[PDB]
Amino acid sequence: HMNPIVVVHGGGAGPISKDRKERVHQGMVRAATVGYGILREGGSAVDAVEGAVVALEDDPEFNAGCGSVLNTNGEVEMDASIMDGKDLSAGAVSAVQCIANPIKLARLVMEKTPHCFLTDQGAAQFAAAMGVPEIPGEKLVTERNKKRLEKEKHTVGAVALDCKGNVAYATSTGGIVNKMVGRVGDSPCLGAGGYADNDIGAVSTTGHGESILKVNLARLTLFHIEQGKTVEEAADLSLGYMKSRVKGLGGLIVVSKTGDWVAKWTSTSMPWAAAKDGKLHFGIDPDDTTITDLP
């Protein structure tokens, strides 16, 4: 059987202030912990990516769930997607409002409907039918995200390979500050925000959503693995192309079908954590990687 693994990311960002880096560090550790605990007890790859991303959705420090960036009207509209590498089954939602966990709604879509993608009002109606609670929009809005919008005017992901050799990705976001109402980015679109395939691996992406969509970044990365590039070579070429062709920045996490993994980015930073062989691997800036024991 396969030694399991989970990689998590807290999105592409520019420079991060001293004190924020600590709470971001705290957030990543817990997310990878939730995911690795699931894998260490024979939970599936899908269960693991879902668990890790709920933690980041629940933590107001991250642009997904509580703490999502606000649209051009000071409201939170969220996108999410999840994918099962075994049969390529998938679920996704876009521009969802007044719910706590977008990623959980995407897994409902995957397992419970005959569809792969629901949006906006239809996503709300399915949620309520699934008994997903309705939370006031203000429970998702932070004070820092109010400040960010008022100044602009004037993502999170996980991959996992489980003990059976199944792979999975999940991605969840509030989008991009000052976005038009109903703007949908890459995060709920398979092949762009993420892709999972047992015969190759699983990728989750972050960064400029419009660019990620244009180059199909997640699927693109896996293409290169199929050519015989390493996970790191594949990440370099795909992000390189998004930079060269459309002038877009971001980052990605990937795991191969055989357990190889990397976190690479072309923006300044990308908080990432990994857990494989009882250890925790963490970083934010290039080559700041710390390795700790994860009992």
**Collapsed DSSP state (helix, strand, coil) of residue 189:** coil
Per partner kind, with CB cut-offs from 5 to 8 A, the member of Na ion, a second copy, none near residue 59 is Na ion
- Name residues contacting Na ion, limited to 244-283 (CB under 5 A): none
Instruction: Name the token pair of 18.
Output: 């001293």
Is 131 known to sit in a ligand binding site?
A: no
76 vs 222 by CB, closer to Na ion: 76
Site membership for a second copy, residue 249 (CB under 8 A): no
Among 213, 239, 263, 274, which residue interacts with a second copy (rule: CB under 8 A)? 213
Smallest separation (angstroms) from a second copy to the CB of 287: 31
Is 35 known to sit in a ligand binding site?
A: no
**How do beta strands 118-119 and 90-96 pair?**
parallel
Rounded to an integer, what distance in angstroms lies between the CA atom of residue 185 and that of residue 15? 23
Site membership for a second copy, residue 291 (CB under 8 A): no
Catalytic residue among 72, 119, 155, 292: 155
Among 219, 257, 276, 281, which residue interacts with a second copy (rule: CB under 8 A)? 219
Distance from the first to the final alpha carbon of the chain: 20
Strand partners, 2: none
Site membership for a second copy, residue 195 (CB under 8 A): yes
DSSP symbol at 190? B
Range in contact with a second copy (rule: CB under 8 A) among 15-23, 141-149, 155-163, 211-219 = 211-219
- Name residues contacting Na ion, limited to 65-84 (CB under 5 A): 65-67
All residues at 6 or more sequence positions from 158 whose CB lies less than 8 Å from its CB, including other chains: 6, 7, 8, 9, 31, 35, 48, 49, 52, 53, 169, 170, 204, 253
Per-residue interface string for the shown chain with Na ion, residues 47-66, x marking contact by CB under 5 A: ----------x-x--x-xxx
Rounded to an integer, what distance in angstroms lies between the CA atom of residue 211 and that of residue 133? 34
All residues at 6 or more sequence positions from 246 whose CB lies less than 8 Å from its CB, including other chains: 211, 214, 215
Among 25, 179, 264, 276, which residue interacts with a second copy (rule: CB under 8 A)? 179
Range in contact with a second copy (rule: CB under 8 A) among 31-39, 139-147, 159-167, 191-199 = 191-199
How many CA atoms does the CB half-sphere of 88 hold within 13 Å?
Answer: 6
**Total of chain residues touching a second copy, rule CB under 8 A:** 44
Is 85 known to sit in a ligand binding site?
A: no
The DSSP element (H or E) to which 197 belongs, if any, is strand 194-197
72 is catalytic: no
Give Cα separations from 77 to 51, 163, 210 (angstroms).
21, 35, 16
Residue numbers of the site for a second copy (CB under 8 A)?
77, 87-90, 92, 94-95, 113-126, 179-185, 189-192, 195, 209-210, 213-216, 219, 223, 245-246
Active site residues: 155
